[PDB]
Design an enzyme around this catalytic site. Structure first.
Site, PDB file in Angstrom:
ATOM      1  N   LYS A 162       0.821  -1.205   0.000  1.00 34.20           N
ATOM      2  CA  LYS A 162       0.000   0.000   0.000  1.00 34.20           C
ATOM      3  C   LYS A 162       0.859   1.260   0.000  1.00 34.20           C
ATOM      4  CE  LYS A 162      -2.301  -1.540   3.417  1.00 34.20           C
ATOM      5  NZ  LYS A 162      -1.656  -2.876   3.286  1.00 34.20           N
ATOM      6  N   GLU A 196      -5.210   8.939   6.652  1.00 38.71           N
ATOM      7  CA  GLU A 196      -5.625   9.797   5.551  1.00 38.71           C
ATOM      8  C   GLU A 196      -7.039  10.294   5.813  1.00 38.71           C
ATOM      9  OE1 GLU A 196      -5.291   7.448   2.048  1.00 38.71           O
ATOM     10  OE2 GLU A 196      -6.819   5.993   2.656  1.00 38.71           O
ATOM     11  N   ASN A 244     -17.634  -4.815   3.429  1.00 39.63           N
ATOM     12  CA  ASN A 244     -16.509  -4.528   2.534  1.00 39.63           C
ATOM     13  C   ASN A 244     -16.368  -5.587   1.441  1.00 39.63           C
ATOM     14  OD1 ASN A 244     -15.995  -2.259   4.085  1.00 39.63           O
ATOM     15  ND2 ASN A 244     -13.783  -2.629   4.186  1.00 39.63           N
ATOM     16  N   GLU A 263      -6.926   1.683  -5.287  1.00 37.78           N
ATOM     17  CA  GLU A 263      -6.029   0.569  -5.556  1.00 37.78           C
ATOM     18  C   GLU A 263      -6.367   0.027  -6.936  1.00 37.78           C
ATOM     19  OE1 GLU A 263      -6.274  -3.048  -5.569  1.00 37.78           O
ATOM     20  OE2 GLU A 263      -4.096  -3.314  -5.592  1.00 37.78           O
ATOM     21  N   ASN A 267      -6.342  -3.622  -8.868  1.00 41.68           N
ATOM     22  CA  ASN A 267      -6.167  -5.067  -8.821  1.00 41.68           C
ATOM     23  C   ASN A 267      -5.409  -5.548 -10.051  1.00 41.68           C
ATOM     24  OD1 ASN A 267      -7.581  -5.285  -6.396  1.00 41.68           O
ATOM     25  ND2 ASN A 267      -9.550  -5.560  -7.437  1.00 41.68           N
ATOM     26  N   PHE A 286     -26.282  -9.247   7.490  1.00 40.19           N
ATOM     27  CA  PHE A 286     -26.227  -8.941   6.058  1.00 40.19           C
ATOM     28  C   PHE A 286     -25.521 -10.048   5.281  1.00 40.19           C
ATOM     29  CE2 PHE A 286     -26.832  -4.048   6.106  1.00 40.19           C
ATOM     30  CZ  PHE A 286     -28.182  -4.250   6.279  1.00 40.19           C
TER      31      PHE A 286
END
Ligand SMILES: Nc1ncnc2c1ncn2[C@@H]1O[C@H](COP(=O)(O)OP(=O)(O)OP(=O)(O)O)[C@@H](O)[C@H]1O
Ligand SMILES: [Mg+2]
Lengths: 229, 673, 219
Positions: B122, B206, B241, B294, B296, B354
């Site tokens: 990252k 951030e 997520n 990002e 992939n 969920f």
């Protein structure tokens, strides 16, 4: 052979033919299907005879001397004698001494057992069926006597069980001998499988003749009447 | 598809599931013999039969089967496979696999090792992005180590700042701060879990970006340098997520921003020197401040919707790139064709958190392939088994139309004509998602599921008209079953005197209310009065087909009678949601009023095991006074880590589980008070 | 419910590992009409399953072994349960469908002392005297004389089929096929389609037996 006959006599037992000779009237046994090879003999002696002048069909197993396993010929001979008995309407007496049968296996053995079971079920209520267990019987051979009308055992010499003590030890993890697993006392006192137990082979055969005197030959006949005093 | 174009004759797919089937079908389309690898469990999968040859790998777990380096190398050298394809996941980013294969003479279809290593970190990704002159998420340019630096950064940039450490492959250490007070105590806490989890403590704090929408740009690269961007892909709908619903031609995005995103993605790909197919992820907010999240390096899971909108095949193009041929398309050739929407049918129960995955075997499976504009990417079949060793997925459903509304309508129709019996799917949740007013309008954010359903997923709220339609359909089915039961064959000894009832007075118990229904039959038309309201239900009334189509007052509705009992219970699927209805005759209901209800000792004080898997973390002991929301046990299952809380206050009577114990569904783990 | 409906979900329901078990109720539900099954004694002697169902609209009796419980071994209680069900079905002209995965009888001293011999003979008798049509499907296992019990041909089992995983032995189905113990090796997905067809042929089955007042079942 002669040595095997002597070995059988050492345990206190008789061979198949001497058992038949004691059971039947003298000079009345007529063997059937003599010439079939399983080696000849097929380890079963089948035929017809007379008790006190009345017709009967009989088979006697001979696994202790000249028999390997439950070949198709063995069950075929038994089925043939049962079919004859149905045809004429006479009882069947079976002396079970299946103390052998290799390692208790055989692909064609189970089919023969199924045929014999079918014959027993068809005969049930048509002709009397008596089973005398005169030696150790194990596996699927124990269900045909259970399907017959009366079951008799010989003390200390005959056994009835589906699985031997080896399998019971392997699976259930308990130690029981042959006698306490399927002995005559077990099946006459706390199992409800056998009907009577006799001292030895001669006593059992004499009592079997006496018992056979009571029964009718088939269900088309009335109850027997002897001479009363 | 050009079979004349020479391509690797033998290809091994180092993956499993629907992606293996997709790759196999693409190779078969271009005329290529395809070998497939499978563990012992997956020996009966669809892809092993779809492949011309098979190479069993070994043990059931994916760590020792699909992640086994030695086993896969043995397979390569024994089958002499010319090419390898990883799909996604598993060995998508396995750099040692890439180098070991490069040591051999077998070509890997995907990104190069250098790009994978560069983009994996990252910090390195952010550094390369900011050298690439691409706008990035605002935040501290460095690593914070103490609370003083954290509070200073929060003051001089913005109070809502994430406290995020490094690593975080499963999203660990991804906490957020919102004020000065949080940036010290929460800073200590986050440092504590970072040390516990990985320990590198390299923070990437951030500024928070409110109400964003996760957008995906399909960047196609090659060894020839040039890169092409393929429209966009909206993936705003996310639970825990994870993407669930994806529509490719994003509604919020407009042409100027389309060009901006394409140029930024292509420039970033050139900076990374990407030479394969990948996706660029953007976090554009309501203020149109795009921020590179990002990129992939592997093939994206939701690529078929982009394939549908663009009329292109990504697998064939990327395999041709791997062959050596250059890219054969131009930006002008790329365009939009209508609209397309895709959902992921998973083997999870949407009511619990969920989505709480379950386990089972598909006793019945049918896809709506006959329905127009429907594409199903599924790696299972009737009799397939869901296992704890792999991802809890059932299928991917993609519907395309000339407009967004047409695509949504076709997707609802497909979801209503899709038969899954054996496991608990989540088709209901997808149904409310694609029929939600906000989703139809377009106003969607990454917190869509959090605020639309605050307490959680409850089901489809029936309108009064829809409730009447459901009651009418249930009553009609009940009467149809009785009428069929009355039909025997002729006996000629005791002739059957058929009863001549004309009206059925029923009591139907939906949810909690009790409704009085009067049903009358005339040929194939049922006149049903529910609380006075009159309806006419007509259908062929086939009682053996899994799907039954009725024509309630002209409105066509497809229903599924999932279960029926002689006691009147009936579980029926209406509009994707399963409803339990208890139909009795009026006399039966009057007599049932006297039946004593059986009291259930539902006094809590217990805790079962909804996750069939391995309990790997136990935080309780016999005698623990837990509270509401306190985590009890963590179970690894479905290759997913889920933490469950007590939900109430009660002392632990006893614990019937340990950390790292295989526990199935329905097992009592921790007794409570 | 069409009588030719395929059941592809049955093609991989029997695991290859002989130690691993499966649920016979899944097979029963897949094969019968509308997946409706009235199970008799669902909570007693659960190593055998008996019940009523319909095939092509005609009432049928279902007998099967349950490898989930006790590995499918037969014992006293299961023998009595199956025997009574089979006798009732035969007495009222109801066809019987049997699913066979029995590895033999349950060993032990308790079984022998309880009279396992006569209680097993009850099930043998019940299957042997039946004159209604009988269809038999061997799924995996037929060890021991228990194979003869599930009407192995010689007990008048009219049509007998074996799955490609059936392992008829004493202690592969090729021995059984060669000797003539199966009429075919069928794909598990065609089971229903086969059975229905047979039930149409055997509906007019008639058997003649010797006269008697009644038989002496080993009660
Ligand atoms: N800076 C951020 N601000 C807000 N949400 C974020 C941020 N970074 C990530 N997310 C959320 O997390 C999702 C992606 O997380 P991330 O990629 O870091 O997860 P991961 O566990 O590393 O793996 P994966 O790539 O499979 O998601 C986004 O779609 C978004 O919902
Ligand atoms: Mg990402």
């Amino acid at each position: 052979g002669q040595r095997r006959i002597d070995a059988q006599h050492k345990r206190g037992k008789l061979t198949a033919r001497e058992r038949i000779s004691l059971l039947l009237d003298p000079g009345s046994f007529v063997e059937s299907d003599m010439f079939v090879e399983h080696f000849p003999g097929d380890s079963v002696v089948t035929g017809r005879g007379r008790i006190n002048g009345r017709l009967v069909y009989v088979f006697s197993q001979d696994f202790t001397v000249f028999g390997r396993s439950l070949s198709g010929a063995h069950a075929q001979k038994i089925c043939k004698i049962m079919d004859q008995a149905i045809t004429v309407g006479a009882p069947v007496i079976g002396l079970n001494d299946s103390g052998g049968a290799r390692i208790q296996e055989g692909v064609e053995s189970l089919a023969g057992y199924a045929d014999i079971f079918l014959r027993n079920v068809t005969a049930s209520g048509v002709i009397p069926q008596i089973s005398l267990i005169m030696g150790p019987c194990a596996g699927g051979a124990v269900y045909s006597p259970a399907l017959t009308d009366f079951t008799f055992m010989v003390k200390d010499t005959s056994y009835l069980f589906i699985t031997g003590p080896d399998v019971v030890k392997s699976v259930t993890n308990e130690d029981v001998t042959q006698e306490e697993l399927g002995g005559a006392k077990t099946h006459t006192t706390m199992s409800g499988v056998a009907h009577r137990a006799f001292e030895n082979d001669v006593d059992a055969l004499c009592n079997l003749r006496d018992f056979f005197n009571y029964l009718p030959l088939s269900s088309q006949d009335p109850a027997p009447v002897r001479e009363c005093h | 598809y050009d079979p004349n174009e020479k391509t690797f004759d033998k290809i091994l797919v180092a993956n499993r599931g629907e992606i293996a089937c997709r790759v196999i079908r693409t190779c078969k389309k271009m005329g290529i013999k395809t070998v497939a690898i499978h563990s012992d469990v997956d020996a009966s999968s669809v892809h092993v039969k779809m492949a011309d040859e098979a190479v069993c790998v070994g043990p059931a777990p994916t760590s020792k089967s699909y992640l086994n380096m030695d086993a896969i190398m043995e397979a390569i050298k024994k089958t002499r496979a010319q090419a390898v394809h990883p799909g996604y996941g598993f060995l998508s980013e396995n750099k040692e696999f890439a180098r070991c294969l490069a040591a051999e003479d077998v070509v890997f279809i995907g990104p190069d090792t250098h790009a994978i290593q560069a983009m994996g970190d990252k910090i390195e990704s952010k550094l390369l992005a900011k050298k690439a002159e691409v706008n990035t998420i605002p935040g501290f340019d460095g690593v914070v180590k103490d609370a003083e630096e954290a509070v200073r950064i929060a003051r001089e940039i913005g109070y809502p700042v994430m406290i995020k450490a490094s690593a975080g492959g499963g999203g660990k250490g991804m906490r957020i701060a919102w004020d000065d007070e949080e940036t010290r105590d929460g800073f200590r806490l986050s440092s504590q879990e970072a040390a516990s989890s990985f320990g590198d403590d390299r923070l990437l704090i951030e500024k928070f970006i409110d109400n964003p929408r996760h957008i995906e740009i399909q960047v196609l690269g090659d060894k020839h340098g040039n890169a092409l961007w393929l429209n966009e892909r909206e993936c705003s709908i996310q639970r825990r997520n994870q993407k669930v619903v994806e529509e490719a031609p994003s509604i919020f995005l407009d042409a100027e921003t389309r060009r901006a995103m394409g140029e930024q993605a292509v420039a970033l790909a050139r900076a990374v020197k990407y030479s394969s197919a990948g996706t660029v992820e953007f976090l554009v907010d309501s203020k149109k401040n795009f921020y590179f999240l990002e990129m992939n390096t592997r093939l994206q899971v939701e690529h078929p919707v982009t394939e549908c909108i663009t009329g292109l095949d990504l697998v064939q193009e990327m395999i041709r790139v791997a062959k050596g041929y250059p890219l054969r398309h131009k930006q002008a050739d790329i365009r939009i064709n209508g609209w397309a929407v895709e959902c992921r049918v998973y083997a999870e129960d949407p009511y619990k958190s969920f989505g709480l995955p379950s386990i089972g075997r598909l006793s019945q499976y049918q896809e709506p392939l006959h329905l127009p504009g429907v594409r199903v990417d599924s790696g299972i079949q009737p009799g397939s088994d869901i296992s704890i060793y792999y991802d809890p997925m059932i299928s991917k459903l993609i519907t395309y139309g000339s407009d967004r509304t047409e695509a949504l309508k076709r997707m609802a129709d497909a979801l209503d004509n899709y038969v899954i019996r054996g496991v608990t799917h989540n088709i209901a949740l997808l149904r409310e998602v694609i029929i939600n007013s906000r989703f139809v309008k377009g106003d969607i954010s990454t917190k869509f599921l959090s605020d639309v359903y605050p307490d959680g997923f409850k089901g489809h709220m029936l309108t009064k008209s829809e409730k009447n339609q459901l009651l009418a359909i249930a009553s009609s089915l009940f009467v149809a079953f009785q009428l069929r039961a009355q039909h025997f064959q002729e006996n000629s000894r005791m002739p059957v005197i058929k009863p001549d009832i004309a009206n059925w007075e029923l009591s139907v118990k939906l949810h909690d209310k009790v409704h009085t229904v009067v049903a009358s039959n005339n040929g194939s038309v049922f006149s049903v009065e529910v609380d006075g309201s009159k309806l006419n239900v007509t259908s062929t009334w086939n009682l053996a087909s899994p799907l039954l189509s009725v024509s309630v007052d002209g409105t066509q509705r497809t229903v599924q009678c999932l279960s029926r009992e002689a006691g009147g219970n009936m579980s029926i699927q209406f509009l994707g949601t399963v409803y339990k209805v208890n139909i009795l005759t009026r006399l039966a209901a009057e007599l049932n009023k006297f039946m004593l209800e059986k009291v259930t000792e539902d006094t809590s004080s217990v805790l079962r095991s909804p996750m069939p898997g391995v309990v790997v973390a136990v935080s309780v002991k016999p005698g623990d006074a837990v509270a509401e929301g306190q985590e009890i046990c963590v179970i690894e299952a479905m290759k997913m880590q889920n933490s469950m809380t007590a939900g109430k206050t009660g002392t632990v009577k006893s614990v019937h589980c340990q950390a790292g114990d295989t526990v199935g569904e329905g097992d009592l783990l921790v007794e409570l008070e | 419910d069409p009588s030719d409906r395929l059941v592809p979900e049955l093609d991989t329901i029997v695991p290859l590992e002989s130690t691993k078990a499966y649920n016979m109720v899944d097979i029963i539900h897949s094969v019968v009409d509308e997946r409706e099954f009235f199970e008799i004694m669902p909570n007693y002697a659960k190593n055998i399953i008996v019940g009523f169902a319909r095939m092509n609209g005609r009432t049928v009796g279902i007998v099967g072994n349950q490898p989930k419980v006790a590995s499918g071994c037969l014992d006293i209680n299961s023998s009595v349960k199956g025997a009574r069900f089979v006798r009732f079905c035969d007495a009222f002209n109801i066809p019987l469908i049997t699913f066979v995965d029995v590895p033999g009888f349950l060993p032990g001293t308790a079984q022998e002392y309880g009279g396992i011999i006569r209680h097993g003979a009850k099930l043998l008798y019940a299957f042997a005297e039946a004159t209604v049509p009988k269809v038999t499907v061997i799924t995996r296992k037929a060890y021991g004389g228990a194979y003869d019990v599930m009407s192995s041909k010689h007990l008048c089992g009219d049509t007998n089929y074996a799955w490609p995983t059936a392992e008829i032995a004493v202690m592969n189905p090729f021995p059984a096929a060669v000797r003539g113990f199966v009429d075919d090796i069928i794909q598990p997905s065609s089971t229903r389609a086969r059975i229905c067809c047979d039930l149409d042929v055997l509906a007019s089955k008639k058997v003649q037996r010797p006269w008697r007042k009644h038989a002496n079942i080993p009660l």
